Symmetry: D2
Subunit: 392 residues, 4 copies
Amino acid sequence: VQATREDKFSFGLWTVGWQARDAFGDATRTALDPVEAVHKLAEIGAYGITFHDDDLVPFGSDAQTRDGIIAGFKKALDETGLIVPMVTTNLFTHPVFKDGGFTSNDRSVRRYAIRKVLRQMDLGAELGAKTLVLWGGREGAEYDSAKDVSAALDRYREALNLLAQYSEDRGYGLRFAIEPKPNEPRGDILLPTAGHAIAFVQELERPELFGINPETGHEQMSNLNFTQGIAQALWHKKLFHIDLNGQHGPKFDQDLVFGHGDLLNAFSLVDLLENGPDGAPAYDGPRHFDYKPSRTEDYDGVWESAKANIRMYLLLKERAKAFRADPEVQEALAASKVAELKTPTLNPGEGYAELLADRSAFEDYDADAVGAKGFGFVKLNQLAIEHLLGAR
Amino acid sequence: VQATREDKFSFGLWTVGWQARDAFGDATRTALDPVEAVHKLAEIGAYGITFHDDDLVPFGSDAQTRDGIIAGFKKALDETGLIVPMVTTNLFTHPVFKDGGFTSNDRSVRRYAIRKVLRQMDLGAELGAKTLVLWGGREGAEYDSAKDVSAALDRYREALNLLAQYSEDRGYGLRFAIEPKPNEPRGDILLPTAGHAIAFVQELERPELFGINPETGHEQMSNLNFTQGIAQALWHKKLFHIDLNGQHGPKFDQDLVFGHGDLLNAFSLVDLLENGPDGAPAYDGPRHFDYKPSRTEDYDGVWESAKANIRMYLLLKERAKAFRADPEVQEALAASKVAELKTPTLNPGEGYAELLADRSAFEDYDADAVGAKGFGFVKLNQLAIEHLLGAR
Amino acid sequence: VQATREDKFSFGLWTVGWQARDAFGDATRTALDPVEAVHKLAEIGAYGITFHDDDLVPFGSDAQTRDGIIAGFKKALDETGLIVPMVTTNLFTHPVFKDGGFTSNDRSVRRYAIRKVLRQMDLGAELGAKTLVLWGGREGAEYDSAKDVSAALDRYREALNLLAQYSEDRGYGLRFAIEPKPNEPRGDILLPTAGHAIAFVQELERPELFGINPETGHEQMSNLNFTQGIAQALWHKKLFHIDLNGQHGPKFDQDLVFGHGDLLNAFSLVDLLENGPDGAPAYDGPRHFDYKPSRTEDYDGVWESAKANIRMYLLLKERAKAFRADPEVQEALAASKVAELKTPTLNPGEGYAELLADRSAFEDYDADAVGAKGFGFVKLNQLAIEHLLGAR
Amino acid sequence: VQATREDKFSFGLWTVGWQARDAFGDATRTALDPVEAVHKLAEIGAYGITFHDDDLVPFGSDAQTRDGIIAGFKKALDETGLIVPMVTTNLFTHPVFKDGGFTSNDRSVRRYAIRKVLRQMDLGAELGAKTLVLWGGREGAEYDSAKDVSAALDRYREALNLLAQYSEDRGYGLRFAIEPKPNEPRGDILLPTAGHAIAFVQELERPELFGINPETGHEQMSNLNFTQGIAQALWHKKLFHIDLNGQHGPKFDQDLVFGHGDLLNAFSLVDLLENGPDGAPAYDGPRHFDYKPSRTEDYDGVWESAKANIRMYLLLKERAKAFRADPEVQEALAASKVAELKTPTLNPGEGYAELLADRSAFEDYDADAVGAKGFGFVKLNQLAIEHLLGAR
Ligand SMILES: O=C[C@H](O)[C@@H](O)[C@H](O)CO
Ligand SMILES: O=C[C@H](O)[C@@H](O)[C@H](O)CO
Ligand SMILES: O=C[C@H](O)[C@@H](O)[C@H](O)CO
Ligand SMILES: O=C[C@H](O)[C@@H](O)[C@H](O)CO
Ligand SMILES: [Mg+2]
Ligand SMILES: [Mg+2]
Ligand SMILES: [Mg+2]
Ligand SMILES: [Mg+2]
Ligand SMILES: [Mg+2]
Ligand SMILES: [Mg+2]
Ligand SMILES: [Mg+2]
Ligand SMILES: [Mg+2]
């Protein structure tokens, strides 16, 4: 299979650029030059690149340096045809953010965190980015008495409302995507799941400008069903971006290649995003890989892993397509009544009174007889896996 | 410490009445008589009792029978001075509900599920219940291709909108509390965390009427911080009811006595609910125990475990109070800047233009210096634990 | 593909016979007649059937009744040609076993548990069973102070030594396989992982007669790597039997069809078992399916699910074979140095004195140069998955 | 309370010396001087200090320097009276160990790893250490096809056999303690639980020289019951050392102060270690704290956290003794038949023949009457907790 710009595969500069310094060891790889990253990615089929302010411009660079770096980066995008669909800000690495950015108990840190983001919004706008991703990695706590969650949510809200105000006033037209994570690096992070992030966004001043950027491994760290979570995000129309990667359940954040973790869920996910209503994808944004080339690899291993992500997505798509197109699957879908859930429970114009008067819905209903019919779910499931396995 | 009606301890009929028939063994206790249960609960200090329709009136009882049971039940209530703060409907036991009640693939079951709940609403209304708890235990799936999540949410919403319609027309004054659970009995259940349920509720026709009924153990099954999720629920003003119990992380639902699983989180939870805003509780509803007396116990064990629930709460409350009243704690709270989070990040009348003009929030900000000061959070945590252990 | 008797696929009478009564609901299926189960299994390609004493003969059957059942049973076996490779005893259903069988705190229960087992060994020996599986589902605790573990291990060992004795004296020639499980139905089960069971077995009077019966989902309930634990069981030579099924990480025991849980781990498990050293399988006992047809299915779904287990195993076996015969996979293996681990670290005849003498092992070792070479693990993992996907 | 040298509280240099560089951010604390560490710890009550070669002497220090550091370190011990009970080797930080030390696919790395340990054994022997802790943090894999587990166990064994040989020949008198961990930093680590580690040790050439060093957080990362695992380790007589800390279930390794994670299990653990048979502790080695002062803390928080470890153990000890001494507890233990588990199942001289002859153990046994009696476990648990809360 071959990747096209229409596939919209994007990679964070911090992904292929991860030097592999983990919590227990030193880096095993040298630093990647942003310009080189741009050329390599272009080469493997990516349509865009993303970055944290500090990934491109070293924290504390003078404007002369800063400016120089932006200029070169800009050239590279130019020559290669790559776009910058999203930008984000690093509010977790520097020691000042040890208790968070937007929700640090220290007031001065909160003012500083907003400034850092405003600045990144400026660069984003200049490069044509449409989405600002906010990953509140340090917002949370290790101890319950150390953080007033209520106050914290008020402060998270206060900061986001200002950001939307500014973007709207400067006419940047950005969309904001809150990225949920349950833990790591804080004992517990605020807005731990896709659900909590969506509920929170609904309380902002201009909620229509806000959505979520769910990550495969983040939901899997709590042993949740990522596909089902995305389905809910789509129902709400809050899926503004997505970070794809792999994880093996509740343990540290692994960031494996997409599909190298829960393979069955990777399959149902591609199916959900691609076999949307009327042939068309249910999702239109970037298919962004927020992963890390394993610590045991060298740059060869790095480019390999970059391509594996694209490969995995395209192989899965291909099988998801075939699954749905199979008349035997179509038949099994019918038997399991999957589409019958789309029919309203109530007849047209029917209310409580008409339902209360319908004896077939209760008084004359044979629950025992209906309770005995099988749904044929194992069989439908087995058909899906045989398609995944290329055995059908 | 002794329980008062003011404490508002309530228990489900199904908790003390659980016969301890589990997934791998027969019942070890005989059935508990409801009148008996009312009488025993009144005696241990409970102010109220709750029940699923099928816990009181056996599935399929003729009207004569059903009518007789209610009459006896009401009399017991009468005599003991116990109220019915909440009622719920069993939409999970009978085989007809094997693929869900409101979201079953089968349209006829969905219709029947609504009828079963309307009927329970009438009875709750009759007994003076204020809350209708909805636990969608069979809503979800074992395989991703078996359930269209989107359509399922539409149907869950279609059903709730109708229930609210009816309650409102009839003047019942009920409040609806959705109860989230990540799994069990289904592989994955729709609306798995407190967050997912709050986000969903914000999408119904009369949202003001809807909230959640989170359960200690259900959030812990995903390894989430229960106190922290309750904090967010209170922030959204959607904590309509609470189910208290104990659990040991992600494994089957244990339903232990409150405080017998994660004790530290049980402590921070009581602190949150009781050491509210004024001096007053932050939550005013029933303190409901949704637990199960261990299968190894007889009826002496059952009554002991009921009392243990009340005892754990009162003991934790007492230590939470003492913690907050301690001068050394006040000092640790001041050093950790807990209260500083409550001060707006921005000065009154400050917007992005003023923030951008503040050189001190960025250009002249000494992040290195700020990042070197400690928050003293361990010390604060240590004082909290010492209060819990009665060591101070 | 089609299963042959050489494949050695076996099923427990309790798998296809599960009536689907779970922790939250009634059975959805009627009971399966054992003779009918024998015929249906033979028909789908199973070579054997296994059972708990109470699956075949209802608890408390008089001797005439029990004898009658056993005889009809044997006739079915005879006519179909199916064998009984393993038998087991139910020490978890009856209320008497609420605190365990061999380790109940109650002495009389421990004496009864041993007699229930001895009686099953006789029947096993008469049906030709070669393995007795021991699953101590009720040995454990919900509270730490309720059970003396040391005393419990002593009692466990005391019971197992007697069983080996009787078997050896009767010339039964049975091998014993302890089945580990972390929790469910007890909060914590004794001998929680394959590791704990192996270490325990090593302390018996006649260790050579004892091994383990690990189950896919049981190790996954603790989020452990099943293939890797099986690899270690094989290194100790204690894999006496195996239970294959599917699970989705830490949650109640799902008992899905094999391969329907962690697909990638199922794949590597089949590779380990069949692509053993010397062309041949690394394991030669039964490939036993200890699973449950989902509660949503009827008898058609039950047989579909039985056949899905065998199809899953054969498909994965085919892909594991092709994987290994791929010259590109071989080249990747060589590049990743997998086989180089099989070469002793020390030279023949080298001891610490000679090692200490080798400056190339330390003094002149360039750690930094070695440290920079990639292992090519990602690329290898990618080829593995492409084989599973039928993309190669 | 106050710590005495008889409490044997020890700490690793890497604990209070952790600079707080995590997977997502820079160090928030400067480096701690080892002599100072010796002094500081002596002051808070520790009786000993431990370290990794590389904690003390910077990786790649010339002989002169190394010698220099050791001599200063020896003086500080001298001056303060602290001992070095255990020493360990760093086989996880340097890039050369990315695929492991002892089981690296690369043979040259395995040879180098052995040399690096021999050298630490010498320094350990010279400082009077009695235990060599072996933590194979990089032993494992991210991908199943990348590591031959059987070969890795052979190589692990091969390296340990040699270390034992050396120690015995040099007359060092060291005992070896293998430390199990399920994951982090490798996706899956070899010897993931205390169980797997004990089983392994039993296969070595001089097993009497090997035991384990289980860590509270490591077992909790897999959601296992720490106390129960230590109870099994003591049964086997393999508890050579112990690492105490706190953790909040399956997530990244938190390394909190002991008792700051699962409080109830920290209580039962202290009870098991101290309320041993013959009044005396069941365990007499060092109570070693392998924890990390939270990243939000400065050097004051660091010493605060060090003291917290000691305070937690002593407060728990105090409650564990009060618990056992309480007459009501004594009455609950009796009703729970906790001690009846210590009486053999069989009468002295009884074997299967006499057991079979006992109609009362089977034919005339009333399983139903026995099954109806409760064990009073909930009451017993409640008393334990009230003792922990200082409520009794
Ligand atoms: O787990 C870390 C996050 O996934 C991070 O990469 C964000 O997506 C960007 O700040
Ligand atoms: O986990 C089971 C649920 O908690 C149930 O008891 C609801 O609260 C009422 O249906
Ligand atoms: O989880 C229950 C066990 O897996 C059981 O089926 C045993 O294998 C036999 O008693
Ligand atoms: O989790 C890492 C280990 O706990 C480490 O600190 C060892 O005990 C010493 O190598
Ligand atoms: Mg991530
Ligand atoms: Mg991300
Ligand atoms: Mg529950
Ligand atoms: Mg509940
Ligand atoms: Mg099982
Ligand atoms: Mg099994
Ligand atoms: Mg650790
Ligand atoms: Mg350790």
